[PDB]
């Protein structure tokens, strides 16, 4: 790589690139950071812990004019793979995590093109807070979210936007979580209904606050209730309906209250079974609990 | 020892680990990827995760890490920390909730020809579509998709070391038997960039569950309850014990539901066969 090693010396050693400074001509400007989220797989939703675990690939896009070069001068090299610790990064974190894992998991290489665009697709395992609505369990749907923002930089320093795609030379924003139809394996219990993406700006907060801006990726997910149906509802409902046979039993059999109290015991066992599977929230009584 | 010290000082005087180690930037780095499966730690039917202990043998050539053995006292090979040199960034593409890339940076074996052998350990947690239709007599085909995360095929080429994964040092599994194993290379080209193929090597493992645990603990009690269901019809009515027998069988099945739900996969892709048999027994009692 006479060429790739001559280019990196030119960019980083000769010109004195400083990864601490933002890529802006003056401090008053903000760096435009375009974000998109690809859902590799929905790992789980722990109802008791109220935690959503996801495997997501976060596409970052921003311009760094200090990392521009004339391709023809350097053997027509058009793109460079560099470590992420060698360049300025727009440190985006998952704000609404519930385990302290704010940052991406694997800090992969950045891709830097000759016209200054910095591409970066670090994959991450995240564990986010998803408050659970137990009202219609096991026929329930949940509304989880993945809120992304920067704590080291505010809206004064970076502007968060959605990634822009093209079709027939017409630009549109990517306002949804990207899912590869071929590579995506559906979760065994949760079906994705909606998966929007939004840029949220709070007019009340000051511009120099980390809470001014965020990009939130939502997951409206519907439970697939076949397991709970087959294993709880049909046995429990049939056993409960079985109490009505005592009225048709003759009083001379001497086995009436035994049948009824045994049905009560079976219902208590089912209650014990259900008590392990949901959190002890007071917002509502679950449907199965009702 | 002094020859190796002088050699290592000479090699890394003006070395760069960020650039691909090729004489010309238009050359391709060929990485030979070989997967050694050490242990199948666990298969998670609920979250659809297969966790395995593996060795990811990687072999490439660093053009700049060459020396003449005659100039260094006949030293033909040395051991170098992996962090100091350029490496391929192999990633488990279908990682479920584990590490995406190698985290254990062991030393590499560097030959005088520039040939590097790196065999780091890893614990792969890979997503694996579990088909529970024939559970516990089910057969599962889970793979591990591996490829360079940030390098396309035009700069870094990958080829399997062998047609099959290396299972010579595979510890016996008490729950699964590997019927078949095979590694396939795949190349994907998109119309947007026809000259930049994207490569991966996918190792797949066909695994058959050992069902003796579920036969002993789940199926036989259900068969006993199913047999006990019919004996009430031979009891006399004047005994006053028919309801006692039937209701006690129902209560035994209700208590057994705790065992089954803690054992059965809590997924809704399909009804497990054990689930079908238990629903049969419950409905008919």
């Amino acid at each position: 790589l006479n060429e790739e090693e001559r280019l990196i010396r030119h960019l980083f050693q000769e010109k004195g690139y400083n990864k601490e400074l933002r890529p802006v001509a003056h401090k008053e400007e903000s760096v435009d950071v375009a974000l998109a989220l690809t859902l590799s797989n929905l790992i789980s939703l722990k109802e008791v812990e109220e935690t959503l675990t996801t495997n997501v690939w976060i596409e970052h896009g921003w311009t760094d004019n200090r990392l521009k070069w004339n391709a023809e001068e350097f053997g027509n090299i058009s793109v460079l793979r560099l470590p992420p610790d060698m360049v300025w990064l727009p440190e985006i974190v998952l704000e609404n995590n519930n385990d302290g894992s704010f940052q991406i998991s694997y800090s992969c290489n950045v891709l830097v093109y000759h016209y200054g665009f910095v591409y970066w697709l670090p994959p991450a395992i995240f564990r986010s807070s998803c408050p659970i609505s137990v009202t219609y369990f096991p026929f329930d749907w949940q509304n989880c979210s993945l809120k992304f923002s920067s704590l080291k930089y505010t809206a004064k320093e970076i502007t968060l936007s959605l990634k822009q795609d093209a079709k027939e030379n017409r630009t549109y924003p990517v306002e949804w979580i990207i899912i590869d139809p071929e590579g995506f394996t559906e979760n065994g219990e949760w079906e994705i209904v909606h998966r929007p993406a939004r840029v949220n700006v709070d007019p009340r907060a000051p511009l120099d606050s980390p809470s001014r801006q965020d990009i939130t990726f939502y997951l409206i997910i519907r439970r697939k209730p076949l397991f709970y149906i087959i294993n709880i509802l049909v046995p429990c409902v049939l056993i409960s309906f079985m109490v009505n046979l005592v009225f048709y039993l003759p009083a001379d059999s001497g086995e009436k209250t035994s049948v009824a109290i045994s049905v009560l015991l079976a219902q208590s066992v089912f209650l014990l079974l259900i008590s392990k599977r949901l959190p002890a929230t007071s917002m509502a009584i679950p449907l199965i609990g009702k | 020892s002094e020859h190796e010290t002088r050699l290592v000082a000479k090699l890394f005087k003006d070395y760069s680990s960020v650039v691909r180690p090729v004489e010309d930037h238009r050359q391709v780095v060929e990485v030979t990827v070989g997967l050694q499966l050490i242990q199948l730690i666990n298969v998670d039917e609920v979250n659809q995760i297969v966790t395995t202990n593996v060795r990811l043998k990687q072999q490439w050539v660093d053009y700049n890490l060459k020396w003449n053995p005659d100039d260094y006292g006949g030293v033909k090979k040395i051991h170098i920390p992996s962090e100091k040199i350029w490496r391929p960034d192999l990633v488990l593409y279908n990682n479920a909730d584990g590490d995406f890339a190698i985290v254990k940076f062991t030393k590499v074996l560097l030959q005088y020809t520039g040939h590097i052998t790196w065999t780091p350990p890893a614990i792969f947690k890979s997503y694996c579509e579990i088909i529970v239709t024939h559970f516990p007599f089910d057969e599962q085909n889970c793979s591990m998709k591996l490829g360079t995360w940030t390098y396309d095929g035009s700069v870094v080429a990958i080829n399997p070391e062998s047609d099959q994964p290396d299972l010579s040092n595979f510890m016996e599994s008490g729950e699964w038997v590997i019927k078949e194993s095979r590694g396939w290379k795949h190349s994907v080209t998109y119309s947007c960039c026809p000259d930049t193929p994207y490569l991966d090597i996918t190792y797949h493992f066909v695994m058959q569950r050992l069902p003796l645990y579920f036969i002993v603990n789940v199926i036989i009690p259900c068969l006993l309850f199913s047999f006990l269901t019919g004996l009430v019809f031979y009891l006399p009515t004047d005994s006053g014990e028919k309801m006692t027998l039937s209701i006690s069988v129902l209560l035994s099945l209700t208590v057994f539901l705790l065992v089954i739900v803690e054992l059965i996969p809590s997924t809704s892709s399909a009804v497990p066969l054990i689930g079908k048999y238990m629903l049969f027994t419950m409905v008919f009692v």
Partner: antibody
Amino acid sequence: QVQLVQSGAEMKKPGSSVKVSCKASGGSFGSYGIDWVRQAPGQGLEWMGGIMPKFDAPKYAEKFQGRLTITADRATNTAYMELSSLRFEDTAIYYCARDEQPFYDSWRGLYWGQGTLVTVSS
Amino acid sequence: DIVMTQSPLSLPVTPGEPASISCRSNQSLLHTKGYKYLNWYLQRPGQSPQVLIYFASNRAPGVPDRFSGSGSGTDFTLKISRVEAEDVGVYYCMQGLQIPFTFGPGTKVDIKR
């Protein structure tokens, strides 16, 4: 001190086959960067075939298609050609040109063998 | 196929002075990335071919400083700053853009007298 050593000279009959090996020492070569070039007596160099990363499979000239099989083995550091249905004008010195690190789209000969003379005559 | 022609058919060379050889193609040898895929090879008498220049201006490792090359798409030139008596042989230009790759007829070099 990278050296490519080919197999010895061959005396073949028309319609037979010849397999020429190309073994390397002093360097590490891969599954690509292999090209076979023959020089007929009194004629110029002629490219026969080779394996490049872009095709990830051998490509041959139209003359040798259906008759030539070029393979490279990274494990043994050896490259092979096998020309079948040998004809009288297949008499030539057959060279192997190889690179340790292959170019994606084309090839360069930085390391050559000494050439293997194949004589096809009855 | 791309047709490669070299001039002169023979170049007689006075050890100590420069020399020049030219190649030609009936098709553009320019890659989509601007790389002119032409290689120059030397075959000394009784020896295997040896590369001197690759991609029309890049000197291969180990080749002495004397050899150099240049060209544009279809017209290419190989130059020797000073000719030494070890540089005698047939010089071949080859196109490496389109399969089948083709060598030129070959330009023979000999000591001038």
